Design a protein around this ligand. Structure first.
Ligand SMILES: CCCCCCCCCCCCCC(=O)SCCNC(=O)CCNC(=O)[C@H](O)C(C)(C)COP(=O)(O)OP(=O)(O)OC[C@H]1O[C@@H](n2cnc3c(N)ncnc32)[C@H](O)[C@@H]1OP(=O)(O)O
Ligand SMILES: Cc1nn(C)c(C)c1N(C)S(=O)(=O)c1c(Cl)cc(CCCN2CCN3CCC[C@@H]3C2)cc1Cl
Length: 411
């Protein structure tokens, strides 16, 4: 049923994943020297290209490919429009490997036809807590703990094939060449997410959405007017009233994050994320890169009291092109990023996130039900959406876990 994925080191069915008890690799052990030195063969009219994602025109080329060809909703009403500044941020974290950014161009005119990107991440991906309990009962604690040390792996994102080249088996070639380049760097696992169902997720979470500009969301058919609103004479004014938010944050001591906050934010974030079965481990440099504010891209606020950072939240911007409605070009979405609360309830912290996002002109706040995101859904008027985000490993057997045991945000 899967001419490509059946040949790959991933669990092949849900029934197989249901039987996995310990974390660990799936493929035969290999070394860098076993991996082909030469790029994977591609047809003569095409060439491999490694873009320089710190060069403005290379970023712009990838930006255009994604703008016109990346993920759409199922009704082709919206398509992600990640900005050039966002792409540079997401693709060039500390110690990133340029060779892991893989493109295909038409050799004749250098037209960009396809892209896939990998970035390094340090991930805790050892056997989850519930399976360690079973392992202990069975005398298998050592094997269950074998791969507990955080692992330096690849995170894959931004797979895209031009619309005119679809269903020609180019995606498997891109994946194969990315795998080769990552393996040549002595890295053997990857983590990736998708909205679609592939073999075989270790976790899946529903998307949730918080209306910030409901009149726009209804107009573009992102949101509907619930049936119960028809019992009122003006359902739209009632809708706006329901979603209204304060004009300024409520938490005393909230301010934008600054460079000197990096060590404190690292400590509180790492203390929080260590409670989840799967999660990243961030250095100071990675905290700085992923969390310090960048205009139009990432927004991060801390709660400071007694000159100490006790809480923080972050969100990032991904607009989507509104394909079918001529009255609006873009849907401006804020996505919940990392956060940590030690002094206030999480719903009180995330209310300030919604306020800041609304004040800055965002139309909706999106998130997946990872981390403790479910704990503020009802209080802050998030609604479940149609979409899901499925989490996958390449070359890593892993038991099924709930999305609330996942602490890795994927951009
Ligand atoms: C150690 C290091 C390892 C590094 C790599 C780790 C693995 C990373 C894996 C990538 C993680 C990416 C994470 C994200 O970015 S998820 C976002 C994916 N991008 C989009 O949805 C953008 C719009 N769509 C496209 O650009 C294309 O339709 C794509 C590129 C998605 C498929 O192109 P096309 O439509 O022209 O099809 P084909 O004829 O070339 O190929 C068909 C084969 O492709 C399999 N397919 C379809 N969709 C996906 C998908 N989203 N992940 C993995 N495989 C997918 C499909 O099952 C079939 O295989 P099989 O069913 O026959 O077996
Ligand atoms: C406004 C809007 N624009 N677009 C393009 C869509 C679909 C919408 N919606 C309608 S949606 O409700 O907001 C929504 C929906 Cl249905 C489904 C999904 C499934 C995940 C898609 N990918 C896969 C690759 N990447 C991994 C990490 C981020 C990214 C997520 C995501 C969303 Cl974000």
């Amino acid at each position: 049923a899967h001419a490509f994925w059946s040949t790959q080191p991933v669990p092949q069915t849900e029934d197989e994943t249901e039987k996995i008890v310990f974390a660990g690799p799936m493929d035969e052990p290999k070394t860098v020297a076993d991996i082909p030195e030469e790029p994977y063969p591609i047809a003569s009219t095409f060439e491999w290209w490694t873009p320089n994602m710190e060069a403005a025109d290379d970023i712009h080329a990838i930006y255009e490919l994604l703008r016109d060809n990346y993920v759409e909703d199922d009704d082709s009403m919206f398509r992600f429009n990640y900005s050039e500044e966002f792409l540079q941020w997401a693709l060039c974290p500390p110690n990133y490997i340029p060779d892991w950014h893989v493109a295909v161009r038409r050799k004749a005119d250098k037209k960009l036809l396809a892209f896939i990107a990998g970035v390094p991440v340090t991930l805790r991906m050892g056997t989850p807590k519930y399976m360690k309990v079973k392992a202990q009962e069975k005398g298998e604690g050592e094997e269950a703990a074998k791969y507990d040390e955080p692992r330096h792996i690849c995170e894959i994102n931004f797979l895209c094939v031009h619309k005119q080249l679809r269903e020609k088996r180019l995606a498997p070639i891109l994946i194969k060449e990315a795998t080769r380049r990552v393996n040549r760097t002595n890295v053997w696992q990857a983590v990736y997410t998708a909205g679609v169902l592939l073999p075989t997720p270790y976790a899946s979470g529903q998307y949730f959405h918080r209306s910030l500009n409901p009149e726009k969301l209804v107009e573009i058919r992102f949101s509907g007017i619930p049936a119960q609103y028809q019992k009122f004479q003006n359902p739209m004014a009632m809708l706006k009233r329901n979603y209204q938010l304060p004009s300024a944050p409520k938490n005393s001591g909230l301010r934008e994050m600054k460079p000197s906050d990096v060590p404190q934010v690292r400590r509180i974030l790492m203390n929080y994320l260590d409670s989840f079965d799967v999660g990243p481990v961030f250095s100071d440099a990675e905290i700085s890169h992923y969390l310090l504010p960048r205009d139009g891209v990432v927004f991060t606020y801390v709660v400071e009291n007694d000159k100490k950072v006790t809480d923080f939240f972050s969100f990032y911007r991904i607009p989507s092109t509104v394909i079918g409605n001529s009255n609006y070009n873009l849907l401006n979405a804020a996505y919940v990023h990392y956060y940590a609360a030690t002094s206030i309830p999480l719903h009180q912290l995330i209310l300030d996130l919604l306020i800041v996002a609304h004040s800055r002109g965002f139309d909706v706040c999106n998130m997946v039900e990872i981390l403790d995101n479910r704990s503020f859904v009802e209080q802050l008027k998030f609604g479940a959406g149609d979409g899901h985000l499925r989490y996958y490993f390449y070359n890593w057997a892993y038991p099924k876990i709930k999305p609330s045991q996942v602490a890795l945000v994927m951009l």
